[PDB]
Amino acid sequence: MDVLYSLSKTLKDARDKIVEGTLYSNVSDLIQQFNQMIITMNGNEFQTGGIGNLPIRNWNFDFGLLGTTLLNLDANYVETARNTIDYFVDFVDNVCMDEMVRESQRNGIAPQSDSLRKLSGLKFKRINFDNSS
Amino acid sequence: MDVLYSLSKTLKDARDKIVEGTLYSNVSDLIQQFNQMIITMNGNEFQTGGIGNLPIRNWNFDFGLLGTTLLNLDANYVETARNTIDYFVDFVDNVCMDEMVRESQRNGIAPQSDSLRKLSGLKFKRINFDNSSEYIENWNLQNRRQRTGFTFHKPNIFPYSASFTLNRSQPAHDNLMGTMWLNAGSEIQVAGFDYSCAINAPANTQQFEHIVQLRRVLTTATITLLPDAERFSFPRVINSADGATTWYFNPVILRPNNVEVEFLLNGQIINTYQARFGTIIARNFDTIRLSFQLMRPPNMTPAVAALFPNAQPFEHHATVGLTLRIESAVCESVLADASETMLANVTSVRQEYAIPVGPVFPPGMNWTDLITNYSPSREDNLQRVFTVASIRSMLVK
Amino acid sequence: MDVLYSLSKTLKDARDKIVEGTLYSNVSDLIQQFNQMIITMNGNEFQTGGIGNLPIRNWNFDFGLLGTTLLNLDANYVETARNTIDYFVDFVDNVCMDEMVRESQRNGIAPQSDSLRKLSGLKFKRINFDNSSEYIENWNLQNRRQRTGFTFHKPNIFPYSASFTLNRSQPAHDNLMGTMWLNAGSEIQVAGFDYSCAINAPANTQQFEHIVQLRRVLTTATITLLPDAERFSFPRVINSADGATTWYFNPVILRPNNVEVEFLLNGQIINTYQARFGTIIARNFDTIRLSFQLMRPPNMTPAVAALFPNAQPFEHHATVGLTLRIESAVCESVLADASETMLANVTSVRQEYAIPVGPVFPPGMNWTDLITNYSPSREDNLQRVFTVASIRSMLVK
Amino acid sequence: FDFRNSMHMLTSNLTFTVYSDLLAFVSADTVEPINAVAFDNMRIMNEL
Amino acid sequence: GKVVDSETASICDAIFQDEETEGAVRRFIAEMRQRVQADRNVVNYPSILHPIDYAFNEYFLQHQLVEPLNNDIIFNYIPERIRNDVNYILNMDRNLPSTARYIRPNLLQDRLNLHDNFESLWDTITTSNYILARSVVPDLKELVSTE
Ligand SMILES: [Zn+2]
Numbered sequence A: 001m002d003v004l005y006s007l008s009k010t011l012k013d014a015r016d017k018i019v020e021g022t023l024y025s026n027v028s029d030l031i032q033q034f035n036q037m038i039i040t041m042n043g044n045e046f047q048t049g050g051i052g053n054l055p056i057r058n059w060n061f062d063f064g065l066l067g068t069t070l071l072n073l074d075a076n077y078v079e080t081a082r083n084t085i086d087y088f089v090d091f092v093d094n095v096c097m098d099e100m101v102r103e104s105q106r107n108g109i110a111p112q113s114d115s116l117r118k119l120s121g122l123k124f125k126r127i128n129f130d131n132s133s
Numbered sequence B, C: 001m002d003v004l005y006s007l008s009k010t011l012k013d014a015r016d017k018i019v020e021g022t023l024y025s026n027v028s029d030l031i032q033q034f035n036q037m038i039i040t041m042n043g044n045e046f047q048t049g050g051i052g053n054l055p056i057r058n059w060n061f062d063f064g065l066l067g068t069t070l071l072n073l074d075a076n077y078v079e080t081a082r083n084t085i086d087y088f089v090d091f092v093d094n095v096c097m098d099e100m101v102r103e104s105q106r107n108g109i110a111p112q113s114d115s116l117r118k119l120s121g122l123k124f125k126r127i128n129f130d131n132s133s134e135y136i137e138n139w140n141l142q143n144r145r146q147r148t149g150f151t152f153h154k155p156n157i158f159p160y161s162a163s164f165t166l167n168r169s170q171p172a173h174d175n176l177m178g179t180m181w182l183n184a185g186s187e188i189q190v191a192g193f194d195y196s197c198a199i200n201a202p203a204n205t206q207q208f209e210h211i212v213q214l215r216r217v218l219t220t221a222t223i224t225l226l227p228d229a230e231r232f233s234f235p236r237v238i239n240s241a242d243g244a245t246t247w248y249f250n251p252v253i254l255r256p257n258n259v260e261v262e263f264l265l266n267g268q269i270i271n272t273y274q275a276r277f278g279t280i281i282a283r284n285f286d287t288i289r290l291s292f293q294l295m296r297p298p299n300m301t302p303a304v305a306a307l308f309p310n311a312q313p314f315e316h317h318a319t320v321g322l323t324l325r326i327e328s329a330v331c332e333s334v335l336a337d338a339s340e341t342m343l344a345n346v347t348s349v350r351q352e353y354a355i356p357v358g359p360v361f362p363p364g365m366n367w368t369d370l371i372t373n374y375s376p377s378r379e380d381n382l383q384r385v386f387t388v389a390s391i392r393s394m395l396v397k
Numbered sequence D: 001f002d003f004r005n006s007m008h009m010l011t012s013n014l015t016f017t018v019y020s021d022l023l024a025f026v027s028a029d030t031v032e033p034i035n036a037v038a039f040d041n042m043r044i045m046n047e048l
Numbered sequence E: 001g002k003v004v005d006s007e008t009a010s011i012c013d014a015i016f017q018d019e020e021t022e023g024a025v026r027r028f029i030a031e032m033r034q035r036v037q038a039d040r041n042v043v044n045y046p047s048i049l050h051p052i053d054y055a056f057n058e059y060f061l062q063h064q065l066v067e068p069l070n071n072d073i074i075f076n077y078i079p080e081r082i083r084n085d086v087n088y089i090l091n092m093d094r095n096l097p098s099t100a101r102y103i104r105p106n107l108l109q110d111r112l113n114l115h116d117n118f119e120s121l122w123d124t125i126t127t128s129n130y131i132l133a134r135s136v137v138p139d140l141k142e143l144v145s146t147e
Helices: A002-015 A028-041 A075-099 B002-015 B025-041 B075-099 B134-144 B342-352 B367-372 B376-392 C002-015 C028-041 C075-099 C132-144 C341-354 C369-374 C376-392 E006-016 E022-029 E053-060 E070-076 E121-136
Strands: B021-025 B158-168 B177-185 B187-193 B207-227 B234-237 B246-249 B251-254 B256-265 B267-274 B278-295 B315-332 C046-050 C057-059 C156-170 C175-184 C189-193 C205-225 C235-239 C248-249 C251-253 C257-265 C268-274 C278-295 C319-333 D009-012 E042-046
Touching: A002 A028, A002 A075, A028 A075, B002 B025, B002 B075, B002 B134, B002 B376, B025 C189, B075 B376, B134 B376, B134 C057, B158 B207, B177 B207, B187 B207, B187 B278, B207 B256, B207 C156, B256 B315, B267 B278, B278 B315, B342 B376, C002 C028, C002 C075, C002 C132, C002 C376, C046 C075, C057 C075, C075 C376, C132 C257, C132 C376, C156 C369, C175 C205, C205 C257, C257 C319, C268 C278, C278 C319, C319 E006, C341 C376, D009 E053, E006 E022
Parallel strands: B251 B315, C251 C319
Antiparallel strands: B158 B177, B177 B187, B187 B315, B207 B278, B207 B315, B234 B246, B256 B267, B256 B278, C046 C057, C156 C175, C175 C189, C189 C319, C205 C278, C205 C319, C235 C248, C257 C268, C257 C278, D009 E042
């Protein structure tokens, strides 16, 4: 669960703090966190949906990191990034929605979906952060 | 534009994180960003004003930097800084205000002022940072274009409208049937009245209906629906449709029968609720249709029977009603609501500086007029102007 | 002038052929041409405006060349370019508009503005290229004493004219004979009426004729000719020729007899068609002559006989007519038509900037007035002004 | 190995001149000792 | 065309000839020239490394710890005092090319508070700083004959 959270403030504090120009050092502490994620992911397949009118979209991972080199971000840097975020966006949506319907009388407080039951896994907790929401 | 934004979160995340004490470390990633700015600036002359009662202060730039040769910020460090910020504050104010008035039909969605037209310049883009302020977050997404969106408590979607429609009337106005309503802001109250209490109506039931077409689609709306329209539950003397005379309304209220609320989108029913009062969700709609009936009571105690005779004069007028309030909703277009100060900020700056009526906005930024004819040009200008107001409120309230 | 042209196909074939992706050598022959320009420019200062509500903007130049490298154009390359084009765009606009208003008598065909008079300069000619834009293609050929026109449509050759001519009339207007018509744009409708139904006419036939003189020759015209003038087939109350009273027209329509259309050039018949309805070709003409007759029906059923008595009152007025429409044609002179936006562009820019009436064009660029007195000066100014409008529309619509 | 993904463009400055030690460029003489003065300004060592 | 460095060079001449490498390659290698702007000091040279290599060398460029240099800065590396101590004369003589470049001295204070436990070492410092001092303290003059 807490996992899930990060995945977002990750993107927001991302799709927000990354604009044509900004001097790198406003994100050094950020870029890092980001990459860390990509790694943990790549290689693990995922499944969502499977009820009512909820499509069964499948997902895969294999993405390049993010050159932490440059001092001032050039437009070209952004686009090659936004294109990688828009897969996580369109992803998470399909993720939230999937566990935003299943219910359980007994332990109806814990995770349910084949998507999330795999997230609470241990090898993933290498991500949590900035829980101010 | 995006430029503008930074200039602020720069100062706020500045005038806030810079105080007698703290360890450098908290601002290392910050100080830097800051300086970068100063550089790009120094040397460029700026002009603001030249309209109505708006001063024309000119600004020169020649400022030092910020040593990074310290750990704990000594008071002396602050003051030598605050003095340099207070020129940017008193500046930005004079900047926002300047572009918070000019309007353009053709390209209203764009920058205008001799101040900003120079900001969108390329040599300045070297600044932009920390775009988490709900409004900018949405400004950007709108230029690449996608599912934009905002949040409003008791939004302001209904232009003020208070009227009636007599479906059955006669000169004496002694046996009317019709509806009267008040649509305003986020609320609708509508009453259906039948002076005859459906005495000659099929199944002794009179059908009523009230349709309200929103100028913009609302999504994820939390709505309160209650039976009765208190506003139309008391005696009134009203002007006739032609304004030639006045009629008397003496209501007695009955429960609305077969209540059905439909939230439609492009003619399609998206949500429908049958006699459900309390809190209901309307997830995506551009139209609300309220249908309800007055059913003559099949069984009446003497006191009730006495109010509804078989023949005129009809002295107690059977009335049924509904009240609907949109507590919160999301809209892809900016709107005024009950919590945000944007409309008030824009309207206030224009009023204070005696800004002349322009070609886009109605006189006085009148909300009813604006939302009634919410053209693309008015919306683009409104969004630009609301986004600037939000940038300004980060520093000046 | 020709200068001006390039400045555009430069940008279009630019803002179009340059995008995140394309391989290197798809722009080699292009990049070059581009730069060449920048050079010639930088250093020279420009000015636009100073007339009516036209913003007097000042322009300067000083832009770097390029990084004539990288294979598959990297995004970063684009943006650093688009930012340099958007100064030329917003420029040219302010340039076209400036010379899209000034009129000159004696020699009005040439450049006027302080902006353009400097462009025809020699040190600038180092730019012209790709003159396939129908209009420039024709501008050049014209400075070379040579023939060639433009392809038009549902053209606008006829100044508005709606009137009648009574060949036989009397105070009561109860037994008239004559014609009424509407010439407008590319269409002509004409009706011949004879209240007496040729009762006393030789061979019981009344001859009619309608002549229309074009202000410019049209060549290669595709024309639709149909019997009947629907516009003059209904009852009317019309003002008398002297404006002192009104007459009644109550038409009943008969087929036009012995229809003959002649397309003449300098008095000579170039094309002639006898009773041919549908699509006909008129290859070169400056005049159209429509001749048609009303022939009293030699045999009439009772219902028909009843409409045409031997003696007055004549209550049903025998009418025959023709409709002619020029679908397309070529003209050696610029004209307004139903597809091109030139006239509208010129008229619109002048109206928007409150440009004062000048010495050449009629108030409001009124088409009827313009084509009615289409002097050489008006045509030279119109062509200059239309060519500029077309250059502008390559970038700004 | 994919070429285009390996080929990069280079932003390098052009022709500096590095200086160390520094100071040196400081031309400086000194009054004659008999004329000293402290923050005082009246004179240090004033007992003729 | 002029290019980056040795390796960069080699590679080109090399591939240029491995027949099976898109006619586009030769092209690019071909017409692609350096970037030489005299004014400003710009030099954009065509190069080739590798993702991880560009990575390196890159930051090395974006962190050229080399600030400018004006007569003014020289004047400034000087204690606010002394300049305001008449007894001492200051003046300039050499000019400064807009080529001037130095290396920040990095003088962040104590950072480490040894002055509250590491006696052993302070003593060694003081000692040091002390001898240092004697080396400077000007010798005296004009005394009163001992005898
Ligand atoms: Zn057509």
